Design a protein around this ligand. Structure first.
Ligand SMILES: NC(=[NH2+])NCCC[C@H](N)C(=O)O
Ligand SMILES: [Cl-]
Ligand SMILES: [Cl-]
Length: 237
């Protein structure tokens, strides 16, 4: 936190292809990075009395950038995991999600359970816990792991993959803008998937500032409003 205050800016790593949390929106003819995680980042920077600097990158590189010191925080829809918790400090959680499949709409009732994915092609984002889930459970499937979420959506449209695994709000956001797609019936037989801010190990005072901010936004209902606003603003008109 002292290094951050002294340098006058907070550098946040994120991958802006993940509405409602972070995404690109055309504003006045130019793409701008927006979303509920950007509003969370702004609140943290305000708490610390510093400027906010975004560092957009592929999701696969977000955590590594925090680990090496190239960014101060990852605020990028990052799930806590035991493996990650060994290497990173995490904030208190700020969102909890279920995993879903997005499919072509004619396939929404084909996929009920994981067994229905046998002999099918399933995509997930490279570096995500969804990619890990697919690798660990779907031995009878062909797995595609792509750096960019938009490219997973393109592959699902071209019928190059049969399904893509995404957390529910993100899946819903893509369906809003793609009426050729739908959320499948499938559920996974559920540990917690909770989003948190990642930071370097042993950053106690930075964690305090982040957690004070999350606590405030939760108790006021503001965080809920931010996610809803961002979801609405991600729908293309
Ligand atoms: N901005 C993004 N692309 N976020 C992807 C997050 C996926 C998942 N919650 C994870 O932490 O692995
Ligand atoms: Cl890609
Ligand atoms: Cl610290």
């Amino acid at each position: 936190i002292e290094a951050i205050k002294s340098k006058g800016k907070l550098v946040v790593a994120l991958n802006p292809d993940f509405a409602p949390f972070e995404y690109q929106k055309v504003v006045d003819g130019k793409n701008q990075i927006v979303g509920s995680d950007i509003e969370l980042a702004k609140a943290i920077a305000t708490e610390l009395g510093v400027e906010l600097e975004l560092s957009p990158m592929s999701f696969d590189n977000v955590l590594a950038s925090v680990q090496s010191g190239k960014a101060d925080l990852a605020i990028s829809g990052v799930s806590k995991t035991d493996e990650r918790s060994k290497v990173f400090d995490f904030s208190t959680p700020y969102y909890t999600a279920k995993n879903k499949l997005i499919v072509k709409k004619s396939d929404l009732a084909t996929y009920q359970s994981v067994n229905d994915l046998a002999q099918k092609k399933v995509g997930a984002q490279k570096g995500s816990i969804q990619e890990t889930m697919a690798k660990d459970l779907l031995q009878n499937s062909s797995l595609v792991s792509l750096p960019k979420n938009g490219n997973l959506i393109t592959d699902l449209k071209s019928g190059q993959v049969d399904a893509v695994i995404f957390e529910e709000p993100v899946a819903k956001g893509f369906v809003e803008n793609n009426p050729d797609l739908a959320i499948a019936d499938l559920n996974f037989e559920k540990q917690d998937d909770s989003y948190a801010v990642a930071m370097k190990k042993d950053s106690k005072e930075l964690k305090e500032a982040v957690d004070k901010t999350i606590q405030k936004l939760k108790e006021s209902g503001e965080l809920d409003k931010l996610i809803e606003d961002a979801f609405k603003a991600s729908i293309e008109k």
